[PDB]
Amino acid sequence: NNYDGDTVTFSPTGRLFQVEYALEAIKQGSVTVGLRSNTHAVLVALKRNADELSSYQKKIIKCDEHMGLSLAGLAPDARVLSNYLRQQCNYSSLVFNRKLAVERAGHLLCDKAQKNTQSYGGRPYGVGLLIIGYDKSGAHLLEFQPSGNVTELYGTAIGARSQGAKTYLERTLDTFIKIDGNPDELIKAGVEAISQSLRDESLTVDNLSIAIVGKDTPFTIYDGEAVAKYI
Amino acid sequence: DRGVSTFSPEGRLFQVEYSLEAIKLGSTAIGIATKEGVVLGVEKRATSPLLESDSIEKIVEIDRHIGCAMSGLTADARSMIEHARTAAVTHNLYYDEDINVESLTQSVCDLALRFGELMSRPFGVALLIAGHDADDGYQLFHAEPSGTFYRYNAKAIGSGSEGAQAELLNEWHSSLTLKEAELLVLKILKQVMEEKLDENNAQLSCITKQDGFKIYDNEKTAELIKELKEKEAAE
Amino acid sequence: TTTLAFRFQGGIIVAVDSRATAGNWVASQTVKKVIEINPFLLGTTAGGAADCQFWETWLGSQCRLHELREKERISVAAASKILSNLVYQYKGAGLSMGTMICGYTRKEGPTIYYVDSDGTRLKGDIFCVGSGQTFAYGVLDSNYKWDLSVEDALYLGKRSILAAAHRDAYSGGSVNLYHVTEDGWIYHGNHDVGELFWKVKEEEGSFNNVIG
Amino acid sequence: GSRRYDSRTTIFSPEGRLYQVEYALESISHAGTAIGIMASDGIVLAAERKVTSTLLEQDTSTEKLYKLNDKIAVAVAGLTADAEILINTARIHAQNYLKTYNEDIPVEILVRRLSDIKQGYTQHGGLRPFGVSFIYAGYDDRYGYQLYTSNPSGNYTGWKAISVGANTSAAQTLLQMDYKDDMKVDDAIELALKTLSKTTDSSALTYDRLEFATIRKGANDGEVYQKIFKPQEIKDILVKTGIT
Amino acid sequence: TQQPIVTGTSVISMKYDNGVIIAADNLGSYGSLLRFNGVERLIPVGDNTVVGISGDISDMQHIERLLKDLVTENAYDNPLADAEEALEPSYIFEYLATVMYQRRSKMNPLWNAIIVAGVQSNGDQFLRYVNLLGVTYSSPTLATGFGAHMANPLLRKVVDRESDIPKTTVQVAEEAIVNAMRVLYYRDARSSRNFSLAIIDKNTGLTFKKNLQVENMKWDFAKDIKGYGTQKI
Amino acid sequence: MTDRYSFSLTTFSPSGKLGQIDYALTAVKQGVTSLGIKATNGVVIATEKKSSSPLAMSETLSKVSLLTPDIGAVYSGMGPDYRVLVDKSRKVAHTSYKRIYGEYPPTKLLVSEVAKIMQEATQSGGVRPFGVSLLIAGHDEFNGFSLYQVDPSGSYFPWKATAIGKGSVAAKTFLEKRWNDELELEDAIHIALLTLKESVEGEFNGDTIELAIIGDENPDLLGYTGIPTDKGPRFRKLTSQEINDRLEAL
Amino acid sequence: QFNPYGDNGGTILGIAGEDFAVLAGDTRNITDYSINSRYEPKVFDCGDNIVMSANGFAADGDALVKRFKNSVKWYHFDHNDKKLSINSAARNIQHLLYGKRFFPYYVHTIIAGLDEDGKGAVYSFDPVGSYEREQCRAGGAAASLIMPFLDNQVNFKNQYEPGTNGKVKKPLKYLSVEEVIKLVRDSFTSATERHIQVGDGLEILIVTKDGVRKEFYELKRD
Amino acid sequence: GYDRALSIFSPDGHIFQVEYALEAVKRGTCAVGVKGKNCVVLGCERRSTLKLQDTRITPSKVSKIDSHVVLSFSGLNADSRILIEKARVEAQSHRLTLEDPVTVEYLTRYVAGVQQRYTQSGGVRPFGVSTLIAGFDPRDDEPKLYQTEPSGIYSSWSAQTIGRNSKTVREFLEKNYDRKEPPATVEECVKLTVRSLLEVVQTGAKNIEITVVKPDSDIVALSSEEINQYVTQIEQEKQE
Numbered sequence A: 001n002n003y004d005g006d007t008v009t010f011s012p013t014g015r016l017f018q019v020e021y022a023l024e025a026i027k028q029g030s031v032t033v034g035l036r037s038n039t040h041a042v043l044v045a046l047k048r049n050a051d052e053l054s055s056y057q058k059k060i061i062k063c064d065e066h067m068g069l070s071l072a073g074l075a076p077d078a079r080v081l082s083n084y085l086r087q088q089c090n091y092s093s094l095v096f097n098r099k100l101a102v103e104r105a106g107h108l109l110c111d112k113a114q115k116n117t118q119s120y121g122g123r124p125y126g127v128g129l130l131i132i133g134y135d136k137s138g139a140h141l142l143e144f145q146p147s148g149n150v151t152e153l154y155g156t157a158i159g160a161r162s163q164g165a166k167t168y169l170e171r172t173l174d175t176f177i178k179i180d181g182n183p184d185e186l187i188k189a190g191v192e193a194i195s196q197s198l199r200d201e202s203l204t205v206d207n208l209s210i211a212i213v214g215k216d217t218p219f220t221i222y223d224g225e226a227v228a229k230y231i
Numbered sequence B: 001d002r003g004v005s006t007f008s009p010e011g012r013l014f015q016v017e018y019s020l021e022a023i024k025l026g027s028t029a030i031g032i033a034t035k036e037g038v039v040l041g042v043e044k045r046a047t048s049p050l051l052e053s054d055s056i057e058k059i060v061e062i063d064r065h066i067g068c069a070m071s072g073l074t075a076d077a078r079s080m081i082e083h084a085r086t087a088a089v090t091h092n093l094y095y096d097e098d099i100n101v102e103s104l105t106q107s108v109c110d111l112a113l114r115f116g117e118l119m120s121r122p123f124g125v126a127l128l129i130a131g132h133d134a135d136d137g138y139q140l141f142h143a144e145p146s147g148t149f150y151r152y153n154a155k156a157i158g159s160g161s162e163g164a165q166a167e168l169l170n171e172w173h174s175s176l177t178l179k180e181a182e183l184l185v186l187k188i189l190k191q192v193m194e195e196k197l198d199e200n201n202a203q204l205s206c207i208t209k210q211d212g213f214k215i216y217d218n219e220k221t222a223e224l225i226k227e228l229k230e231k232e233a234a235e
Numbered sequence C: 001t002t003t004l005a006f007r008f009q010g011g012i013i014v015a016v017d018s019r020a021t022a023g024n025w026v027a028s029q030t031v032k033k034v035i036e037i038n039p040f041l042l043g044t045t046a047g048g049a050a051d052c053q054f055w056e057t058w059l060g061s062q063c064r065l066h067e068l069r070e071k072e073r074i075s076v077a078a079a080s081k082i083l084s085n086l087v088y089q090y091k092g093a094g095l096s097m098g099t100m101i102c103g104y105t106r107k108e109g110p111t112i113y114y115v116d117s118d119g120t121r122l123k124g125d126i127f128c129v130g131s132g133q134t135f136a137y138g139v140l141d142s143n144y145k146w147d148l149s150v151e152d153a154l155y156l157g158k159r160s161i162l163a164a165a166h167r168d169a170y171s172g173g174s175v176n177l178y179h180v181t182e183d184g185w186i187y188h189g190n191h192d193v194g195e196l197f198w199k200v201k202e203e204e205g206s207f208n209n210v211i212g
Numbered sequence D: 001g002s003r004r005y006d007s008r009t010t011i012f013s014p015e016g017r018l019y020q021v022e023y024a025l026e027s028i029s030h031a032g033t034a035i036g037i038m039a040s041d042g043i044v045l046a047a048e049r050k051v052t053s054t055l056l057e058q059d060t061s062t063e064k065l066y067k068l069n070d071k072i073a074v075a076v077a078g079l080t081a082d083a084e085i086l087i088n089t090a091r092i093h094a095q096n097y098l099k100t101y102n103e104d105i106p107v108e109i110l111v112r113r114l115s116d117i118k119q120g121y122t123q124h125g126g127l128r129p130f131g132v133s134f135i136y137a138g139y140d141d142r143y144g145y146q147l148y149t150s151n152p153s154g155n156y157t158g159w160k161a162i163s164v165g166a167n168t169s170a171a172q173t174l175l176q177m178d179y180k181d182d183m184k185v186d187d188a189i190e191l192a193l194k195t196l197s198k199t200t201d202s203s204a205l206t207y208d209r210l211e212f213a214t215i216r217k218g219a220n221d222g223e224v225y226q227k228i229f230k231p232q233e234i235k236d237i238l239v240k241t242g243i244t
Numbered sequence E: 001t002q003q004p005i006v007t008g009t010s011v012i013s014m015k016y017d018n019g020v021i022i023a024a025d026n027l028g029s030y031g032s033l034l035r036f037n038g039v040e041r042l043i044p045v046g047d048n049t050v051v052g053i054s055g056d057i058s059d060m061q062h063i064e065r066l067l068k069d070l071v072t073e074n075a076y077d078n079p080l081a082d083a084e085e086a087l088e089p090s091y092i093f094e095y096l097a098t099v100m101y102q103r104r105s106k107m108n109p110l111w112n113a114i115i116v117a118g119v120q121s122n123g124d125q126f127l128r129y130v131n132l133l134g135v136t137y138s139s140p141t142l143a144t145g146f147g148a149h150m151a152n153p154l155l156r157k158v159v160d161r162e163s164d165i166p167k168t169t170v171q172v173a174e175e176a177i178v179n180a181m182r183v184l185y186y187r188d189a190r191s192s193r194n195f196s197l198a199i200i201d202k203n204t205g206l207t208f209k210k211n212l213q214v215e216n217m218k219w220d221f222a223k224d225i226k227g228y229g230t231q232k233i
Numbered sequence F: 001m002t003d004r005y006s007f008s009l010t011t012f013s014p015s016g017k018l019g020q021i022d023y024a025l026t027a028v029k030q031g032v033t034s035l036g037i038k039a040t041n042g043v044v045i046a047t048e049k050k051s052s053s054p055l056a057m058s059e060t061l062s063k064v065s066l067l068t069p070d071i072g073a074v075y076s077g078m079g080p081d082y083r084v085l086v087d088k089s090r091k092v093a094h095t096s097y098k099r100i101y102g103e104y105p106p107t108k109l110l111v112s113e114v115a116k117i118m119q120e121a122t123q124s125g126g127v128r129p130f131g132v133s134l135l136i137a138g139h140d141e142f143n144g145f146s147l148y149q150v151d152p153s154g155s156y157f158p159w160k161a162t163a164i165g166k167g168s169v170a171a172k173t174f175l176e177k178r179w180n181d182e183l184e185l186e187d188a189i190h191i192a193l194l195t196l197k198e199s200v201e202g203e204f205n206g207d208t209i210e211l212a213i214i215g216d217e218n219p220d221l222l223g224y225t226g227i228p229t230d231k232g233p234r235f236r237k238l239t240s241q242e243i244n245d246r247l248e249a250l
Numbered sequence G: 001q002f003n004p005y006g007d008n009g010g011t012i013l014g015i016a017g018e019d020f021a022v023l024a025g026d027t028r029n030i031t032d033y034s035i036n037s038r039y040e041p042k043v044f045d046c047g048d049n050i051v052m053s054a055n056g057f058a059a060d061g062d063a064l065v066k067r068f069k070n071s072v073k074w075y076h077f078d079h080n081d082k083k084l085s086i087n088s089a090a091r092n093i094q095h096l097l098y099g100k101r102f103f104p105y106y107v108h109t110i111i112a113g114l115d116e117d118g119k120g121a122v123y124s125f126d127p128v129g130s131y132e133r134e135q136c137r138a139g140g141a142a143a144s145l146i147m148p149f150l151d152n153q154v155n156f157k158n159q160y161e162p163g164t165n166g167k168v169k170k171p172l173k174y175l176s177v178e179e180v181i182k183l184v185r186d187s188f189t190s191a192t193e194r195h196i197q198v199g200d201g202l203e204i205l206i207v208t209k210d211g212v213r214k215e216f217y218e219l220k221r222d
Numbered sequence H: 001g002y003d004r005a006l007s008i009f010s011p012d013g014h015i016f017q018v019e020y021a022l023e024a025v026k027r028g029t030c031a032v033g034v035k036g037k038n039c040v041v042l043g044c045e046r047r048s049t050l051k052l053q054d055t056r057i058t059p060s061k062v063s064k065i066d067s068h069v070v071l072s073f074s075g076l077n078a079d080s081r082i083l084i085e086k087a088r089v090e091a092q093s094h095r096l097t098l099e100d101p102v103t104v105e106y107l108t109r110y111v112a113g114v115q116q117r118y119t120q121s122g123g124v125r126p127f128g129v130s131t132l133i134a135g136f137d138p139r140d141d142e143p144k145l146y147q148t149e150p151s152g153i154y155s156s157w158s159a160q161t162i163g164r165n166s167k168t169v170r171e172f173l174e175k176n177y178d179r180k181e182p183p184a185t186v187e188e189c190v191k192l193t194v195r196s197l198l199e200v201v202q203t204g205a206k207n208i209e210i211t212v213v214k215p216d217s218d219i220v221a222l223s224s225e226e227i228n229q230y231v232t233q234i235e236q237e238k239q240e
């Protein structure tokens, strides 16, 4: 009310309203789902269009050969944060000849988002990210929120009506976690998960967006006729 | 007052949303993409009859293979075009090749959110970026001050945008010829324009792989206007 | 290097050799020393290879930006001055460039500008630049007239490079010919000295110093 | 942050006026009146000191009339402290010109640069404008004797006779009435004092409440002399014109 | 622009079937003066890497601090710091190689020659060299300073190419290293008798040996040598 | 972080007033009375030492300050603001004059430099005006003795005699009756003590009154001998005993 | 005074065929009269069917290759996974080299691959970025020994048709991958014989539309 | 540095600071530009509440940017000096690098760009000025007349007016100016310009300034008597 003019102001109950309003931008964004087994990690994203004449907004971005994310909210902010991740992944490779740990990737994003919530003039990032990756400790899935809070999970979902997919994954936890050495079945589980967040619309060929990374699988994105298999 | 980079309770940037209102006040611009080329057309909208309409430059070349049409606070587009031209030429210098239309649009959209308390406010102009490259062929992009860009088969921006867009929804199909697209832009422009459409208050342009980006003469457009009127009366 | 360009009745002739050296080591015999800036502008390159090629490709980008911004092809004067002002900023840093900006525009007509790395910029009708410039001057000056035909002018330019290619140790390989008219530049072929020398010797009856 | 406390000194009103410039002019309108009158053979500068106290040291005092160089002087109306900042800048600018060209600075050039500084404070920087209006009186070999005025807006104009500060409306009407083009310095001296004498808010105009200066070619052959009047010299000129 | 003051001489090393061996004497020379005798020039990083450093000792101590700090930084927010996300020899080397080349590029080098010896997580032997110029190379045997001239020839007789590595045991490999250290004591004027030796094995791990001495030396023949040509007494 | 206050905190109001300067003058009005009187052969400056507590040692707090050997200063208003101004005033006398001309500045020019500092606090970003009015008494070879007042606006006026602060209105009236152009220094000191007794309420003695003069050169206070041209400081602070001697013949 | 440059010796060689291209280089690394490594590769697969080698001062050579490899990576990120053509790579490398015009990379760079018509391509660079496409180029310590041999055997220079009175030149033709590898091996054995900094081993990288293949051969170790 | 974003968008999509800068232009004295067949004429109003002025030294309303281009304006006088100075510097800079004087379009584009930059730069307010830029391109005889405004938009005009009561004089020009046949001579062009100002000015004494620009750097300012002759001629023809 009087305490939402900027990010540098606390409310009387100890809330940061600008951070909460940034969180609201994610809820308006299109749904995206993340899940993993022990061998592979999968991102599934429902892309959104302006109208029938327009293209479908790309939700998934590659960060390295072993890491990438899906976005929900302000796309330009995802571009800034993904670019930062690309550089940090790259710095780790050039300097230490070392693939950046997915956990460190989360720590770096947390700290970058935080600085924007404590200083005058700047604003919080208006996007949520689901980072997947395969590093020296196996498959990983992270959930980034622009408050700074990063959380490692077996599966999750963010965006509009994400609660449907998140409930499904909470039921399916014991099943999909053990889908080891089988990419297509882990994707199927993700596609069935995102389907629990659909209303009136269904998954079409230029609507669905899937990405996968794993043990002997570099981070690759599937769009167009390549996802027709999973409909 | 309040911060420039402030979020509303709904989760939108106030200044970005207000700049979108400025674009709605602007003159109409329409773009249509085909397999034979991309057509760009604009409403000039002279504020007075004494104003020499040929000096109204709302369609602009970025490179030989990329063209651009604008709508809104058109003065703000000058630094955007300057950046686009430099980005295009610079990439040719670094890589001895034409730059992808998408990559060019992305470079322009990176300027968009570089405002706050960098420039003092967002741009008050929307752009239709049309071009061709070897990979993705003929393309049409709509670049907003939010930093977002969508590819379009056809798109209208400006004051008559929502009425024109609904018309483009019905008329567009994947087998449109270049000549058919040219007439379609003129047709839809004449429908949404306040004053009566002619060669002096409206301008056409296109981009083809063979001849590159070309702004049409007032003589050429006048014949297309005459061809358009005859075809509508013919049934 | 040996490069020349001269102005005459029928426009501009531009001729260059194709050798590149690193000391006495002949590093290449097939270097392109004429840079096509646009259909109406040419630039020649003598001196440091990288310096000339890098900054003249850059010059082409600056000339392209001019015609985008101004909706008009850049003048030969303005193009040459962009390059001369650039190298002048680097004066003392050790750039090595001996170039000639040749072209046609409506307002100027056929025009040649000599531009070098110590900031010198000169408009003129005849210039020869490079380690073998003096050898080219000797033949060019002694046979030059304004009323030369396009055929004779092309040959003189070719013959002048050949003369320098023969005598100058740091020039040779092949001759690249260009002709600049009101309609733009026209390429007149690559001419290997290996065959061109003996062809000229026999037909012309010149080069009597050499064992036939 | 600090946005909360920003007055925004360099913005337009809905009517297209600069708030701070307008309010600075309102401030200047309460300052002691200063009058400039340009004659064919010289210039007069007359100014009224702000409500003087009897224990004020009058002879070793400078409030209104300042010297910029040997050929140019100014009369001040507004905040004195603000005026001194601008005066030192103007003095430096004149010396830079002399150092560069080996010639004394033309009057307009000095006036323009000082007026450009004021303009800057209205368009950028977020600072308050200088609450000062100058009357420039000077001479150069191009235009001869010149009178200018500048105000917080940074706008300057040339004059034959002008007033700044308090009661300019009444003062300008009186100058416009009695001024004529073929006027001499001694006549202009009389006009300047008579105008102040009628427009003054004080009971009676006296020597101790005035500053006076002339810029004549009254020196020996083709050269200009600046005369900043002493207290006794003002007392004499006031008696000579029959005001006291 | 520098000049080295207190200096360390040769660092020698080689690969064997299950790991790597590295050695360096304990001397800190001050020109011709053999100033400091208790200098350790082999610095372990974790339980799987040893960095051997020659050249300027002040810069060596700086590099020690960097490696020490690298271990600390790696442990931050890292539950697997003593497991999968522990520091590898290749990570440690690439870091040093980056620093060395950055410093030479700023015309202010770390005046050192460095050999990073260790065993990777997958069991592979790691042995790579880097110096003040940022020049890097790898070989079955590596040595710095006089070691390059005198040790390498002797160590290459044992492991001349890649295929000789599985055929070389830790006993044979250590014997060659210890022999090389003796030869260097005979012939290098800025060497000492006392040295340290480190073995990084993929099975038995890191074995760090301190206070070794060159022994079994041949000096007896000296008594027979008289004069410089014609002298008989 | 960083100073984001790059804008003026003093601005013109619709009526043409500069609020912060007016309010600064109001703070000076609340301040304790101080005064200055110029004689033919000297200047005197004086003020009351308002003690915050009887446990406090009022000798440690100096309201009258030496700026140069021939210039002194006193104030009315906010003490801390005055203290830092004296520090800056002393430094600027060296940096902008003595290090250039090899001699101390004349009174009017040092006053001009102090006025400049106070003017900048009226216009510069993120600062308030100084809440003090200064009285600066001094001597120099070509101008002789002089007395100046400096206000929060940066405006300065030369005075024959004046007063500032709490009871300045009554004190100025008192000085108008007593002042003439033939006053000797001792007569000016006597008038200063009479004028100050009117505004002081409690104890009136050498311990509660602070008083200094700009008069004859003091070779005994120089600290060295051997250079004839160096004759010693004209600024002298009167002792507690010296004041009480003049209070008996009052 | 500190000298920031060094000479790591070695030599490299690029030959272009009709539908293939090879980039060869010896594996010896040296300083002064000492051998640092008998097998230290300096010919690298950089992705997008581009092979690269930067011979001379190894530290600068590694830095450059490292930077170009990184340039290829960011080219994909910024331009929708577009394949970097050999001509575009060459121009990019010019800017890398000329970027340090006043503190150069002391290396002779050669890249090889296929052009956009599917034909073999070899580009060569001087230390400060001057580049040229050729059928043939040798670089490094033994370049002066190998290059004239290549002129004769690859481009058929100074070779005329027998019995034509030195009037008809030997006609240019593309060489098979088998014939090219023969010339590479003979070039390196000859260079090994007469140049001290060349020997130990030879590593060839062959580039066809199918991908990047490797071949290794022993060289004399003296 | 002072960073505040003074020019910003409002809910209805307007930048009020730019629009309030237009109000300052509307307050300014009237300025008019009319281009003929072989010339351009810049007319300017001078308010007559200022007597006792010195017209020798008072800044003229029309300013030369180069020997071939001129700039008049309406709005804040102090602001106009900054634009004129920048334009004059750019004019010399262009001659230095391109070895050719600026075109009228280029000079206008530059000035317009400066005005635009002040609409989205922190710590600055827009210029309260609209300009009329007129002249002839080098080695060209086609007349050029451009207009700029605080927002930064610029455009070419056959004839145009700006400042106070400009909507009245624009109304006059719109019916009196023929595109098919512009003022054939200098006299015809000046007369139409004076006529248009006489709809608004008051008296045709020392209130109207006229400046005529012709090809090849031929610029001259008319005196009082010369202008007064046009005023006398127009009034006699009016009484009919």
Ligand SMILES: *[C@@](C)(CO)[C@](*)(O)[C@H](CC(C)C)NC(=O)[C@H](Cc1ccccc1)NC(=O)[C@H](CC(C)C)NC(=O)[C@H](CCc1ccccc1)NC(=O)CN1CCOCC1
Pocket (backbone or CB within 6 Å): C001, C002, C019, C020, C021, C022, C023, C025, C027, C028, C031, C033, C045, C046, C047, C048, C049, C050, C052, C096, C130, C131, C170, C171, G101, G104, G125, G126, G127, G128, G130
């Ligand atoms: C005639 C042929 C006489 O030079 C012409 O002037 C030609 C002009 C053409 C090539 C555009 N100029 C040259 O051939 C020019 C001569 C020269 C050499 C050095 C400095 C200035 C001028 N040659 C070059 O520029 C060569 C071109 C190579 C062979 C493709 N380049 C070099 O010599 C390079 C880079 C020189 C350099 C410049 C600035 C900073 C650092 C280096 N140098 C080497 O390759 C060194 N060397 C070659 C032998 O092998 C060991 C390394």
Ligand SMILES: [Mg+2]
Pocket (backbone or CB within 6 Å): G191, G192, G193, G194, G195, G196, G197, G198, G199, G220, G222
């Ligand atoms: Mg050999």
